Ligand binder design. Structure first.
Ligand code: MG
Lengths: 148, 124, 387, 183, 384, 97
């Protein structure tokens, strides 16, 4: 209900070319099943992620489970039940680029969606059947949750 | 009385007028009660390259703590910055004169560690 | 399978000249699918089972494996799985992990060295793989890349055992090997790695007689060639200037003198430096640097290796032209040393650069021995008019 | 896991690439192989070929744990009517058992017979001025004499009047190296 | 006269005792004329080089470069303190970039609240690797060094002087052209106020800790000075024995001086690069150089590693005495230290001969500055 | 050849027109040959402009000062009008010309 995407990933690399920023690092992750790559900037301070972790990641268009489609204002007093209580790390940001392996004759097979969470970048390279919910210059959430 | 616009200078060609005068409760302060008397620009240093101002400030902390008027003849070789830092470290300070200033308005301690210490200023 | 057959027939009828031209046109097929690579390398193994001409098959397999390493295969595990090295498992597994990392681990070479220099060595074809010796040259003779003085002699002993020992496979068993020249090989490679470690250039001029003693050995000469490649091709190197720095280039002349199989790599280094535009140098100084490199190409031409050199000079006069004065200097220095009789390929290749595009500049003041006129007269006397 | 044939076709079925993809040892666990063994005749030939080539990129101890299951996948792979799967099974049948791949590929295949016959004739007639391997730039003189015969001399294309000025260069630098050695 | 910071750059007025002249227009007609022609919002973009002249001056520029990094996060109270200073804020607190565990705003969101209207620019940070746009990650920059402002919101990248400065095509020039000129006045004021008030929380300094490299770097510097000094001495012993050969086009002495200057410039450059590989990303010299606010890489190399060759009239320190530069040197001494090369840095301090040669180079600079002024002013007068 | 590949608007290909334009505009372009003649004439004008520029600029550089920043204006039009450039467009190329 408003979810654009949902998959379980598995952390393979943490910022392998060196650590450019001390508080935020990027995670090179492969999916558990869908064969797709995800490069994710996460705050290590408030939410530490170690290598070899496994996490669920659910891009949702809104947190409110009815799909009420909020504007994006900070409402800390709204007691409408959101989906963020299932999760433990919610990032809001806009998706800024959907490039893909396309040709001027036939369709695109492998898509690559780009999304910035404030400044924290995430590239999700997968197949077009899984990234079809993404639209350029829309507002998405992140909703990751680590699990053993 | 020194007011803003009054032109002060170091002993290194680091002149500058008074921009503003804050009271003591607005001025930042260390873990002890020490506020600055002057706060100079950090951008006044790196293109002008008065490293001797910084070394005067470091030797000033060492001098005011040790209780002796410190020596700054130019061509010495018995005083370099590493000996000054090893003398400063014994009086319970950071090696390189940095000291955690607290903010004077909000009270939240400043994320960077402000270089502080006594220099010799000249009123022009 | 049949396309592979006819392309192998094409290359094996071609030779060393066709080794450069046909091998990407052969390797884009057999590295397209890695299963096709497995099929092709298995055929290379079964054909290289024979000692009656299988060395060229092994060579083509090694260039296909080198192209697979370039394009992005981890094809060393396939290479070790084809080999007899997997009959002795743990050494081959160590080589598998190390050639999958593409770098030298000292602990891994202690694992190897514990298995070598005993009374049961592995069959020496496990260490003769050329990518492994290339990683040795990278990890040992880079001008930086210091080696920590303790497993150093283990490295030198492994390279000496690789490039030294002989064997007699009398029906898949050895009965007579020897180790009596790897002490000299070890001493030579140790002296050369010390000379590459000391990094002090007056000392490089001083111990140059010992370095000339060292480059009598082929593995030493290949290593010095890679070190001079990695030293001279540093940008803004040519700022020490003695006779426009011919010292390392005199080592090029020594490598070209004492051996013959390194000549393609030597020519590749010289034409890499000749194509490289040297910024921040004077233009006359650049021109005399090019004259020095052409002196080295003349020295390669003197020791037999002539036809790729003259082919490159024709290629850079015709296609994407260099300075004409450099080609004139090359013609001047080549014709001051050669004498008849003349093989027809050299005449056929040396004619159009001389007769087209700067006839006049070759003769200025020679007199006592006649210029190009003698070569023109001999060229009329050889061929059938000129045709 | 559940639906593991679809899982192999998902993680390995990008047919636009034909090499063994990396992290193939992290995609081949013994439980996953024992899930492959019952659904092996269902998945496509390209993914099956990726699988059979990825079974060689495992480390030796993991192959030595459960080589029987890998041999069962090999025996099911040799029955398939695909040419590539049959040929790769014929090569790869000896890898978990011995460690070395097969070299006797000659029976059951007229292709291997034609290639080996034509190429044994071609190799037998092409021994003149043979291409020495890339190892021959390294090993010594007498070791090369042991390996692949003596040194083939270059073609004397001309006659040399006088030695070039590089002889003068090496003479002068040897004199300089004597003079520097005595300081 | 309290005047603002970004108007320093067109005025060239650096507050160290500068005094300015203030004219008052007396008629109402000339008051409207000055308001409609010579207002500083109407004089942002100059006609001489079709770029702005205001830009963002030094301390706001370093604080905005540290502000817009990827690892900057802001608590709710610090956000509400910063948004108090935006004049152009419509009263809506943005959705955080981090909702859970803690509501935590990234500094690029507050900077997107600054950036007015809906303007779209793509710039590159000063330390953007040139091999980044070749391979992968050309749209997901691992160093966060690719500035994209898009639909009036800062997507990504760190804003150095190539983003907010007086370079053409910058963010402020496009804010002038796409939006109005009152809107750019607001944009300058909002950047200055809210980035100074974040800088109270952050704080920025410079120190003697920022001028000291670790001992491995000092060993590298001293090994490079020793190697180049021995190389100059062996060039000298080649030059004495007539073994140096002349470069075609000049004398043997000018060939020698080219060799010595080439070795010493290579030493200065190699020691300068080996110094500036060791700042550890918190060094405030690097903080001001990377933002481009004040200084350059040469100042870092001269403070940490080596001052370098001192020059008088484009060549080395001449022989003012009979065939020697100072009476401490032997006659005909063409070495590094005799002829003005300074191997010490400003952290270690100069030896007295190096002090005097450094004073010579500085006197040449002051002579240039003092003699330039009258001739340039007379050229300006004739042209007008 | 890079100029002809990048600027000509090859109309004979079906599938490229199907991806770039909507199907009514596709059959409008493919049916009429007058529109094909006008597209060929504007490529004629761009070859003429290429020869004019190569006379004007013999040094191969193109950093030239001009008033309207057209690429930024195209990108502003994209961001205002919410393009989603994966979908086939709906402006007729004869309206562009
Ligand atoms: Mg002033």
């Amino acid at each position: 209900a408003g979810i654009l995407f949902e998959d379980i990933f598995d952390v393979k690399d943490i910022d392998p070319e060196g650590k450019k920023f001390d508080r935020v690092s990027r995670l090179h992750c492969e999916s558990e099943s869908f064969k797709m790559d995800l490069i994710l900037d996460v705050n290590i301070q408030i939410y530490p992620v170690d290598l070899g972790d496994k996490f669920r990641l659910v891009i949702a268009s809104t947190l409110y489970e009815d799909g009420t489609l909020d504007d994006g204002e900070y409402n800390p007093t709204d007691d409408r039940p959101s989906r963020a209580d299932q999760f433990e790390y919610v990032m809001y940001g806009k998706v800024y680029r959907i490039e893909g392996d396309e040709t001027s004759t036939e369709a695109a097979t492998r898509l690559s969606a780009y999304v910035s969470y404030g400044g924290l970048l995430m590239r999700l390279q997968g197949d077009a059947n899984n990234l079809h919910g993404f639209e350029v210059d829309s507002r998405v959430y992140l909703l990751m949750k680590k699990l053993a | 009385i020194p007011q803003i616009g009054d032109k002060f200078a170091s002993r290194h060609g680091q002149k500058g007028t008074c921009g503003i005068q804050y009271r003591q409760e607005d001025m930042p302060f260390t873990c002890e009660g020490i506020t600055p008397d002057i706060i100079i620009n950090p951008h006044a240093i790196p293109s002008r390259m008065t490293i001797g101002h910084l070394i005067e400030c470091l030797q000033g902390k060492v001098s005011a703590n040790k209780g002796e008027i410190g020596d700054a003849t130019p061509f010495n070789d018995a005083v370099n910055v590493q000996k000054i830092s090893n003398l400063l470290s014994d009086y319970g300070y950071h090696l390189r004169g940095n000291e955690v200033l607290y903010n004077g308005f909000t009270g939240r301690k400043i994320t960077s560690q402000i270089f502080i210490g006594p220099t010799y200023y000249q009123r022009l | 399978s049949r396309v592979l057959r006819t392309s192998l027939a094409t290359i094996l009828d071609g030779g060393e000249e066709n080794l450069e031209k046909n091998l990407p046109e052969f390797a884009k097929m057999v590295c397209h699918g890695e299963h096709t690579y497995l099929f092709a390398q298995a055929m290379m193994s079964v054909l290289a089972q024979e000692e009656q001409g299988g060395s060229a098959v092994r060579r083509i397999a090694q260039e296909v494996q080198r192209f697979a390493q370039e394009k992005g295969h981890d094809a060393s595990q396939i290479t070790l799985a084809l080999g007899t090295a997997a009959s002795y498992p743990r050494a081959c597994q160590a080589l598998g992990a190390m050639l999958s990392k593409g770098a030298l681990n000292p602990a891994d070479i202690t694992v190897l060295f514990k298995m070598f220099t005993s009374m049961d060595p592995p069959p020496v074809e496990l260490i003769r793989v050329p990518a492994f010796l290339d990683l040795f040259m990278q990890s040992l003779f880079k001008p930086g890349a210091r080696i920590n003085q303790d497993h150093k002699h283990k490295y030198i002993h492994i390279l000496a055992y690789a490039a030294s020992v002989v064997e007699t496979w009398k029906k898949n068993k050895r009965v007579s090997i020897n180790k009596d020249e790897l002490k000299s090989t070890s001493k030579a490679v140790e002296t050369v790695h010390n000379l590459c470690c000391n990094e002090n250039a007056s000392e490089l001029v001083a111990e140059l007689s010992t370095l000339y003693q060292c480059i009598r050995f082929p593995v030493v000469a290949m290593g010095v060639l890679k070190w001079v490649d990695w030293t001279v091709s540093e940008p803004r190197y040519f700022q020490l200037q003695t006779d426009h720095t011919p010292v390392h280039l005199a080592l090029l002349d020594e490598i070209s003198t004492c051996h013959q199989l390194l000549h393609p790599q030597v020519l590749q280094l010289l034409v890499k430096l000749f194509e490289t535009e040297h910024s921040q140098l004077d233009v006359m100084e650049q021109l005399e640097l090019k004259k020095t490199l052409l002196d080295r190409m003349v020295h390669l031409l003197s020791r037999g290796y002539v036809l790729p050199v003259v082919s490159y000079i024709r290629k850079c006069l015709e296609k994407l032209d260099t300075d004409i004065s450099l080609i004139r200097y090359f013609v001047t220095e080549v014709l001051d040393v050669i004498a008849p009789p003349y093989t027809s390929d050299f005449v056929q290749l040396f004619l159009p650069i001389l007769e087209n595009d700067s006839i006049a500049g070759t003769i200025k003041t020679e007199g006592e021995h006649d210029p190009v006129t003698e070569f023109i007269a001999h060229c009329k006397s050889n061929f059938i008019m000129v045709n | 896991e559940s639906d593991t044939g679809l899982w192999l076709h998902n993680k390995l079925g990008a047919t636009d690439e034909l090499w063994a993809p990396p992290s193939i040892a992290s995609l081949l666990t013994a439980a996953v192989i024992d899930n492959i063994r019952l659904c092996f005749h269902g998945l496509s030939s390209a993914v099956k070929l990726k699988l059979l080539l990825g079974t060689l990129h495992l480390p030796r101890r993991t192959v030595d744990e459960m080589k029987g299951a890998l041999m069962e996948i090999i025996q099911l792979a040799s029955l398939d009517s695909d040419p590539w799967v049959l040929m790769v099974a014929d090569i790869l049948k000896s890898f978990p058992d011995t460690g070395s791949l097969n070299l006797e590929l000659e029976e059951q295949n007229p292709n291997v017979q034609d290639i080996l016959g034509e190429l044994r004739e071609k190799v037998g007639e092409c021994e003149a001025s043979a291409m020495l391997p890339l190892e021959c730039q390294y090993l010594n003189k007498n070791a090369l004499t042991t390996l692949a015969g003596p040194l083939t001399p270059p073609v004397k294309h001309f006659q040399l009047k006088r030695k070039p000025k590089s002889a003068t260069l090496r003479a002068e630098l040897l004199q300089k190296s004597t003079e520097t050695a005595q300081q | 006269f309290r005047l603002n910071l970004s108007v320093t750059t067109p005025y060239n007025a650096d507050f160290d005792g500068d005094e300015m002249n203030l004219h008052l227009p007396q008629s109402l007609e000339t008051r409207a004329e000055i308001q409609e022609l010579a207002m500083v919002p109407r004089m942002i973009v100059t006609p001489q080089s079709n770029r702005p002249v205001m830009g963002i001056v030094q301390d706001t520029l370093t604080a905005v470069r540290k502000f817009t990094k990827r690892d900057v996060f802001l608590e709710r109270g610090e956000v509400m303190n910063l948004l108090m200073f935006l004049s152009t804020w419509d009263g809506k607190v943005p959705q955080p970039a981090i909702l859970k565990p803690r509501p935590l705003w990234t500094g690029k969101q507050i900077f997107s609240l600054i950036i007015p209207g809906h303007i779209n620019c793509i710039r590159t940070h000063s330390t953007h690797p040139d091999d980044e746009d070749s391979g992968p990650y050309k749209h997901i920059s691992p160093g966060d060094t690719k500035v994209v402002v898009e639909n009036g919101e800062l997507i990504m990248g760190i804003l150095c002087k190539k983003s907010l400065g007086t370079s053409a095509g910058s963010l402020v020039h496009i804010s002038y052209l796409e939006m109005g000129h009152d809107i750019t006045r607001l944009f300058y004021s909002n950047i200055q106020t809210v980035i100074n008030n974040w800088l109270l929380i952050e704080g920025h300094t410079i120190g003697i800790g920022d001028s000291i490299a670790d001992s491995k770097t000092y060993q590298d510097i001293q090994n490079t000075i020793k190697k180049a000094k021995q190389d100059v001495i062996e060039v000298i012993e080649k030059a004495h024995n007539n073994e140096l050969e002349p470069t075609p086009g000049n004398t043997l002495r000018q060939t020698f001086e080219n060799q010595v200057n080439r070795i010493l410039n290579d030493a200065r450059d190699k020691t300068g690069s080996s110094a500036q590989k060791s700042l550890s990303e918190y060094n405030n010299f690097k903080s001001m150089v990377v933002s481009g606010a004040k200084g350059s890489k040469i100042n870092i190399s001269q403070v940490i590693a080596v001052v370098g060759q001192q020059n008088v009239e484009g060549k080395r320190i001449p022989f003012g005495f009979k065939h020697r530069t100072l009476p401490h040197f032997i006659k005909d001494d063409y070495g590094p230290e005799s002829r003005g090369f300074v191997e010490n840095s400003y952290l270690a301090g100069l030896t007295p001969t190096e002090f005097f040669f450094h004073a010579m180079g500085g006197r040449e600079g002051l002579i240039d500055t003092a003699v330039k002024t009258a001739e340039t002013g007379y050229i300006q007068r004739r042209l007008i | 050849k890079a100029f002809e590949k990048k600027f000509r608007f090859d109309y004979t290909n079906e599938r490229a027109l199907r991806r770039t334009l909507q199907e009514d505009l596709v059959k409008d372009v493919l049916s009429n040959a007058h529109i094909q003649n006008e597209l060929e004439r504007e490529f004629e004008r761009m070859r003429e402009d290429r020869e004019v520029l190569r006379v004007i600029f013999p040094t191969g550089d193109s950093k030239v000062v001009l008033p309207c920043n057209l690429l930024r204006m195209i990108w502003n039009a994209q961001k205002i009008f919410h393009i989603n450039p994966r979908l086939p467009s709906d402006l007729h190329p004869i309206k562009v010309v």
